[PDB]
Amino acid sequence: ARGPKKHQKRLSAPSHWLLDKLSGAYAPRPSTGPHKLRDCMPLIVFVRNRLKYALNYRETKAIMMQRLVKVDGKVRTDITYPAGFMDVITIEKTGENFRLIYDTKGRFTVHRITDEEAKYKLGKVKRVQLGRGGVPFLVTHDARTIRYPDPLIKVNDTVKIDLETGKITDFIKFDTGALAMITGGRNMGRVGVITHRERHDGGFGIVHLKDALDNTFATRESNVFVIGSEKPWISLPKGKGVKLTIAEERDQRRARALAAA
Amino acid sequence: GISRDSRHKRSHTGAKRAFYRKKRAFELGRQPANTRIGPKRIHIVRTRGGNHKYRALRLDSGNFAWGSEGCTRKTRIIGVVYHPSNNELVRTNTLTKSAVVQIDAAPFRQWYEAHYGQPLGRRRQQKQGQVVEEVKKSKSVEKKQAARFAAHGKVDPALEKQFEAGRLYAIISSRPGQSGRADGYILEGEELAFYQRKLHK
Amino acid sequence: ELTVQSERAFLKQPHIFLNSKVKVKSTRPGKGGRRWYKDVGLGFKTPKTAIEGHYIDKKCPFTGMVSIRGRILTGRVVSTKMHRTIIIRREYLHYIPKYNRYEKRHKNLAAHVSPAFRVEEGDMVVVGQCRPLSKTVRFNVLRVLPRTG
RNA sequence: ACUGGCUGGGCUGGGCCUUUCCUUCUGGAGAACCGCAUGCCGGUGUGUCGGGGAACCAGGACUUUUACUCUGAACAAAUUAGAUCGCUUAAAGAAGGCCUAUGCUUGAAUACAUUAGCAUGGAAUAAUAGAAUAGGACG
RNA sequence: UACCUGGUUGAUUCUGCCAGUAGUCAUAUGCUUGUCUCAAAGAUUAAGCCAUGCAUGUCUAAGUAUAAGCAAUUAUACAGCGAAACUGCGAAUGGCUCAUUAAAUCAGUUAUCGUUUAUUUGAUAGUUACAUGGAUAACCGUGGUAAUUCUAGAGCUAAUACAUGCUGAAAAUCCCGACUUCGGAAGGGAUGUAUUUAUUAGAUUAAAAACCAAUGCCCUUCGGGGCUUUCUGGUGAUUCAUAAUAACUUCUCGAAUCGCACGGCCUUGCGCCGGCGAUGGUUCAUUCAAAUUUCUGCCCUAUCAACUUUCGACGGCUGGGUAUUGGCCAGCCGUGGUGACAACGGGUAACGGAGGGUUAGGGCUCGACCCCGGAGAAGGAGCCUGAGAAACGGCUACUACA
């Protein structure tokens, strides 16, 4: 259409941003960065629509511009910045640290973490090979490319990154018995244990997982994100991704409310 | 300008198509540049995405290579003698890929003489006008060739007798019109049979 | 085929040097100096007539530079009067929901047939998707099914 | 509302026997049954003790082909059905709620589309091939 | 809410239609009109024609300041704010409409081992030098035409504009070789990356020997017994990733660039070293993408039954051209391709879809129109700049208006 598009019309934005169908005609239109446009978390909606710090468009730009908030340790001031899975956003002058992570309904939450655990990340590897001059390197899901990694590491595995120098600190395999978290689909936010894997030579293999309550579900390999073998390496949010059904959820909620009051 | 789409064509059942859209920026084509023999002249065109291409119009020398001995020297090209597609090209000496041409052996033979002190294709013994030689400034060097000859061997007889005339057969394998450098290699072996009969019969 | 070399140019696999003085016997068909070939995969076996042959056909999925990826279909050989191409017939059943019963339909397709295989009228075929070769050819014959009485 | 019992009556499913049991190779770890003794009240952690056949995983080979049905994966937002909150009610909206608070806490669910394409279980129903001038199967 | 009533006859029972009854985010019109919440609106005929006003520009401490520019008095190169102008970027997004279009657009689902990509993000490049050269804007001053966002000739000057252009060190590899104790060697050249061509490596499944030619050897009683040895990634699949050799090029890139801080050493020299940023730069990866592409699916018509190839119609080969594949194009050669399971052609008061209206179930009908995709700016064609245009609030020519 005679070039690339540069506006994004409201009522077409991703549903998990939780924007109202009234009060304006346009949406923030995230810029281009390390995470997909369809799967990202604009900073402007985070500060104004989630933390309620700013009331209006104008005050939102003042916060990022004054270099008061830094994603992953690097203070980036662009408003429509794409923030994605597993990334760490830290605001130091007020002492809060958040991690973008899914809940059991497939959306983003305001998760609080401690200052000791805000200094490392982990990410899936998509390609590992040797670049020019024979050096070997790999790139993760947020466009970090590290070279000279441990040779044993293979594709689809997960690696831990330090966030101040940026070297692998530990690794995880991808086989039966691991602990994973799904990142896309109907099963967004579930947490399970790899039961076994089924391979289809030619595309789109399937994997079977088992929950803690003995539930069963399945997903594609390119949609699972291993975060541990046992004893998850990060602080899961409230609910721990167990996917209660509707019937119990209403029952327990009323009981807790009456007991509190 | 010229267009390279498929809309103006006729479907595989015979149905005439209808008009869809005006011509597009992409899918275009350019006037075929012609390359011949002459003084070096080159034109540069600016392609899509800030890239450039080269256009050959006239050439006289290009990189050639002898695979068996691994010698690559930019020799001068005489004339195209055979083109598989159509005879019209040969008469006007316009050179394209897979065109049999004539190449001299001035650098290649000179390199062979350094490689070994052995005569190559000499049937001028009757005249012996130009016979001359110079003493190698050692005897260890003859030892080197006396042992190099043991494994490398000798050039086959059919190819040798070609040096007597002083004209070699070559094939162009580059694309004059895209890259600008008419590169080529030198033929050998059973390939001679097929082309030899065709060229001069 | 009667003669291998019958055109204006000389037919040969690219980047396969033949006229080397020293002779060495080894593995890796391409490296040694003999005919080169690969394996497509998916449990498909390269037939012996492809390896112990002399034909040159830069389109054939074996001994050539074309990859197979995409759909895999089956059909019928309706005609083989063309040169190294065939036409395949595929039948299926449409639905027509309102009347709660099906129709018969019909479609023809054109797939490149390699010289390795031999396929007379009335035989099965399996094809796989490749790069655009001709105006209407995008598939290649892979397995002629055994011929039943 | 909670607890146990009937050799209670049924429905769904899984194992063996009746000529029918259910393919096969390589590797991983390892339970039950077995013999040893340091220990306690016919038994067990003992140990880098060892011998069987089998549940799981990874790897390789083999199987008449389509139609049909079950279960999975993937597939916009708005719209349809539909849960919650007294905008003073309603059409609407996705808000809100608690005490006194320099504060705390929640929701923004769920189902369907249905044809075509990708996997999985079922083997009745409707088609199709197989040994007859044996050019048949096995060692 | 799965529903019916009046009408042919002197009166009766039927087939059968006409009329009545209800809804419509479905248009027009007549009569009438006190209040509160919400707000559609030149689509249908004419994608007919347009006066006038507007709808796209942009500066931070960080590209270029001698304003006879403003403001003070810390700057004898300047140092604050700052008109005009050069340079950089966008102007290819938005907004409007539905004329053309019947496997065409479009929908779900696949592929790029067949390509391009400014910008964003992450990595990444040892083979005069206290600094190189000419113009031009703004500007003073002299002009032309009734007419314009027209411009002439004379005199000055800046670059992140244009054009040049050294950069510290050694090892190792292949060739030439000053030199003979027939045994290795003085010294001599090349070796980043960009392009093109040719050759080489890029392995591997279970083992025991026995012969031909000969040279590193350990132990050793000099009779001899022997023999061990290093790497090699990935996909279902490649000539993949990567490396080595021989060469080549009107031939690139490897910072003559700008702001803040004011530091440390000893030969005390207008000496050496040192931080954080901005703007750029070859290649790889990512993001926004784009272009092609596999399978299946569209309303009426037989008073449309055989169509396509003269001047490509189906395929093979060799090249050309494009960012790349391809009958896309140029040559030579075969005779093919679709069809009663409805091809080809004709009509549409036809943009497609998500969807709207009405209901027992099954359906009938509408969809220019707030979301996604496509096309167009009076009708046709052609092109410059750029990563991206066959652009029209860009240019060139014809037609019709003016």
> Which residue in C38, C34, C28, C21 sits closest to B150, CA to CA?
C21
CA distance A45 to A17: 8
Determine the distance from the C-alpha atom of residue C131 to the mean position of all C-alpha atoms in its chain, rounded to a whole number: 13
Reading phi first (left if > 0) and then psi (alpha if -120 to 50, else beta), residue B44 is in beta
**Nearest nucleotide, C1' to the C-alpha of B141?**
E177
CA distance C17 to B68: 9
DSSP structural state of residue B49: T
* Main-chain phi, psi angles of C30, to 5 degrees: -65, -45
Q: Are C68 and C128 in contact (CB under 8 A)?
A: yes
β-strand partners of B62 = B75
- The Cα of C20 is separated from the nearest Cα of chain B by a number of Å equal to 6
Pairing of strands B184-186, B61-66: parallel
Nearest CA in chain C to B84: C8
Are the beta carbons of C10 and B191 separated by less than 8 Å?
Answer: yes
Strand D footprint at Cβ < 7 Å?
A 11-12, 14-15, 18, 20-22, 105, 107, 175-176, 184-187, 196-200, 204, 206, 217-220, 223, 238, 246, 250; C 43, 93, 95, 97, 148-149
Nearest CA in chain A to C72: A202
CB pairs under 8 A between B and C: 26
Å between CA of A175 and C1' of D24:
26
CA distance B196 to B192: 6
Query: Which chains contact B through at least 3 pairs of Cβ atoms less than 8 Å apart?
Result: C
- The Cα of A204 is separated from the nearest Cα of chain C by a number of Å equal to 13
Chain E bases having any atom below 7 Å from a protein CB: 91-95, 100-105, 110-114, 116-124, 176-180, 182-185, 195-204, 233-239, 241-243, 245-251, 283-298, 307-308, 312-332, 334-345, 362-364, 371-376, 380-383, 385-392
CA distance B59 to B77: 8
CA distance A243 to A254: 18
Name the one residue in this structure whose structure tokens are 């035989």: C123
AA identity, residue A58: R
CA distance B182 to A148: 42
Number of CB atoms found within 10 A of residue A185's CB = 13
- The Cα of A136 is separated from the nearest Cα of chain C by a number of Å equal to 27
AA identity, residue C72: I
CA distance C71 to C75: 13
Cβ neighbors of B145 (< 8 A, separation 6 or more) are B115, B116, B117
* C39 reaches B (C-beta below 8 A): no
Cβ neighbors of B135 (< 8 A, separation 6 or more) are none
Return the H-helix or E-strand segment holding B44: strand B41-47
Return the H-helix or E-strand segment holding A63: helix A57-65
> Which residue in C107, C69, C115, C71 sits closest to C90, CA to CA?
C107
Q: Are B11 and B24 in contact (CB under 8 A)?
A: no
In angstroms, this model's resolution equals 3.0
CA distance A109 to A240: 13
CB pairs under 8 A between A and C: 3
> Which residue in A60, A67, A108 sits closest to A84, CA to CA?
A108
State which residues between 69 and 108 of chain B bring their CB within 7 Å of strand E.
70-74, 84-86, 96-98
Q: Are C80 and C119 in contact (CB under 8 A)?
A: yes
CA distance A111 to A243: 18
* Main-chain phi, psi angles of B6, to 5 degrees: -115, 0
Å between CA of A211 and C1' of D58:
23
Give C24's contacts in chain B (Cβ within 8 Å): none
Question: CB of residue C45 closer than 7 A to nucleic acid strand E?
Answer: no
Give C68's contacts in chain A (Cβ within 8 Å): none
CA distance A142 to A84: 8
Nearest CA in chain B to C137: B12
* C83 reaches B (C-beta below 8 A): no
β-strand partners of A219 = A207
CA distance B79 to B104: 11
**Long-range Cβ contact pairs of C47-55 (< 8 A, separation 24 or more):** C47/C116, C47/C117, C49/C116, C50/C114, C50/C116, C53/C115, C53/C116, C54/C4, C55/C1, C55/C4, C55/C115
Residues 12-31 of B with CB under 8 A from C: 12
* Main-chain phi, psi angles of A47, to 5 degrees: -80, -40
Q: Are A125 and A155 in contact (CB under 8 A)?
A: yes
Cβ neighbors of C71 (< 8 A, separation 6 or more) are C128, C129
DSSP structural state of residue A66: T
* A133 reaches C (C-beta below 8 A): no
Å between CA of C43 and C1' of E236:
9
Å between CA of B32 and C1' of E271:
65
DSSP structural state of residue B16: B
B9 SS3 class: coil
Å between CA of A180 and C1' of E334:
62
AA identity, residue B122: R
Å between CA of C17 and C1' of E320:
27
- A205's tokens: 């293999």
CA distance A147 to A145: 7
β-strand partners of B146 = none
Helix runs in B26-129, H state only: 88-92, 106-115
